[PDB]
Amino acid sequence: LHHAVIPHGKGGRSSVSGIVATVFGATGFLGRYLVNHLGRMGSQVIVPYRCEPYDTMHLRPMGDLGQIIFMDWNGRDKDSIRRAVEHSNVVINLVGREWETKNFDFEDVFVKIPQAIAQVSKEAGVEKFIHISHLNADIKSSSKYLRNKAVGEKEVRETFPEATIIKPADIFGREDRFLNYFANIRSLGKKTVKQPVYIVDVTKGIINAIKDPDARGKTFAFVGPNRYLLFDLVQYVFAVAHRPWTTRDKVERIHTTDRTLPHLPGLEDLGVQATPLELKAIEVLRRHRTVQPAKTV
Amino acid sequence: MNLMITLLTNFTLATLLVTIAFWLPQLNVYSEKTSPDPMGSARLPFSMKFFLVAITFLLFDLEIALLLPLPWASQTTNLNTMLTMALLLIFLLAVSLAYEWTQKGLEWTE
Numbered sequence: 001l002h003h004a005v006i007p008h009g010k011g012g013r014s015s016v017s018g019i020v021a022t023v024f025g026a027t028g029f030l031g032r033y034l035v036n037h038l039g040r041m042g043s044q045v046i047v048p049y050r051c052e053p054y055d056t057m058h059l060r061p062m063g064d065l066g067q068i069i070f071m072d073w074n075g076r077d078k079d080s081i082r083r084a085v086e087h088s089n090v091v092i093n094l095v096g097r098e099w100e101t102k103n104f105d106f107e108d109v110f111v112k113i114p115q116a117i118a119q120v121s122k123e124a125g126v127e128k129f130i131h132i133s134h135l136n137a138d139i140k141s142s143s144k145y146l147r148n149k150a151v152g153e154k155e156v157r158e159t160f161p162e163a164t165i166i167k168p169a170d171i172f173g174r175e176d177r178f179l180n181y182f183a184n185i186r187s188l189g190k191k192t193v194k195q196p197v198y199i200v201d202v203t204k205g206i207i208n209a210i211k212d213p214d215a216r217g218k219t220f221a222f223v224g225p226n227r228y229l230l231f232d233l234v235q236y237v238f239a240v241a242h243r244p245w246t247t248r249d250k251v252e253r254i255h256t257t258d259r260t261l262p263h264l265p266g267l268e269d270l271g272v273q274a275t276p277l278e279l280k281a282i283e284v285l286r287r288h289r290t291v292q293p294a295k296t297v
Numbered sequence: 298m299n300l301m302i303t304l305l306t307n308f309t310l311a312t313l314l315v316t317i318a319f320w321l322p323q324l325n326v327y328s329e330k331t332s333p334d335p336m337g338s339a340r341l342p343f344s345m346k347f348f349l350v351a352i353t354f355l356l357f358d359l360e361i362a363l364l365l366p367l368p369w370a371s372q373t374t375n376l377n378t379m380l381t382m383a384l385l386l387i388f389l390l391a392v393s394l395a396y397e398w399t400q401k402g403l404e405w406t407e
């Protein structure tokens with residue numbers, strides 16, 4: 001263990017955490033709060049960005065001087081990935097799209113980019129890897145999202161055998177596409193059952209998967225405390241928000257019930273207590289509003 | 298007919314500029330912002346003085362509504378009566394302003 005990567009300090013901003021992290025997909029919704037939580041410990045956080053450097057401004061107050069290194073990367077360029085991961089001791093993958101674009105489909109985003117990141121991270125000697133799949137990833141699933149994400153989970157497992165794959169159910173926060181989707185929809189009620197998980201709980205889970213040495217080669221399923229139906233959840237979101245872009249793949253995933261996987265460990269096996277929706281839903285939906293809580297199952 | 302075509306063209310150009318001014322920066326996919334004044338949460342305090350200047354405007358505007366046909370009124374064959382009633386209307390506007398003065402009506406918006 002190198003001398004510069006021994007932890008020092010009281011775990012604050014100006015400390016050294018010993019985590020040298022590369023966070024792919026950090027310019028989005030999970031990478032925002034993950035780079036916040038890594039930078040408040042004093043971690044060297046490499047943020048490979050694909051977008052305009054204007055869109056990485058909000059990440060810059062999140063750490064101390066020199067602690068975030070922004071560098072360019074293309075997903076179809078293995079040289080840029082090796083140029084980004086060859087100094088890390090943990091790699092976090094957060095590349096995702098709710099929609100398939102002209103240059104990238106669900107296959108390239110969920111299979112080719114994670115497998116190339118995991119393979120180049122294997123041949124660069126990175127000790128830990130954290131892959132972020134979805135809870136409802138299935139080969140025979142109705143949505144192309146979850147099909148390619150189950151295939152990418154399989155490939156990340158087979159090409160980086162000590163990867164820590166984490167399954168969130170449906171993450172809610174201020175910048176989500178779950179509660180803000182339901183609040184701006186003004187699609188229907190079915191027998192779909194969900195248990196959403198709060199983003200700070202997911203982020204503390206990813207930190208505790210970085211730090212715990214027993215999380216290598218495991219698979220985690222991050223779910224919230226309360227299973228809800230779809231209809232009473234959507235009416236609760238319309239009720240808290242004081243209310244009377246979409247695609248068919250998103251609608252088929254909203255109507256996908258959140259599966260229960262008790263054989264996989266969760267937040268409570270990482271020391272994270274899942275915050276319920278009834279503490280944070282007003283924090284999410286206070287922006288939308290110009291209340292009896294929802295029924296559980 | 299030409300007047301209505303002109304008004305309709307002006308309204309159409311104004312509506313088109315407003316529609317472009319509300320839709321062209323909404324083409325951007327900038328960011329959805331979270332957590333979107335001197336007085337914080339008080340009600341609006343009613344100022345009597347602003348109501349008084351609005352009512353004084355309305356009454357003097359009615360006196361002006363009486364005053365408007367004078368460029369046609371000078372053309373009459375009863376000029377003594379016309380001149381007397383014209384000076385009498387402007388004098389009644391002056392008496393209304395003088396009474397507004399002398400009863401502290403024009404105070405702190407003088």
Ligand SMILES: NC(=O)C1=CN([C@@H]2O[C@H](COP(=O)(O)OP(=O)(O)OC[C@H]3O[C@@H](n4cnc5c(N)ncnc54)[C@H](OP(=O)(O)O)[C@@H]3O)[C@@H](O)[C@H]2O)C=CC1
Pocket residue numbers: 024025026027028029030031049050051075093094095096097098104109132133134135168169170171172176177178
């Ligand atoms: N509720 C949720 O969001 C859930 C998410 N997940 C998974 O978590 C991860 C992150 O999700 P989330 O933050 O919410 O989604 P976002 O869309 O907000 O973030 C995706 C990130 O990946 C980047 N990215 C996307 N496509 C590409 C590409 N082709 N090449 C390079 N970079 C790319 C984006 O950068 P840029 O802006 O520059 O394009 C952004 O940094 C994904 O793997 C997703 O599958 C799992 C369960 C639930």
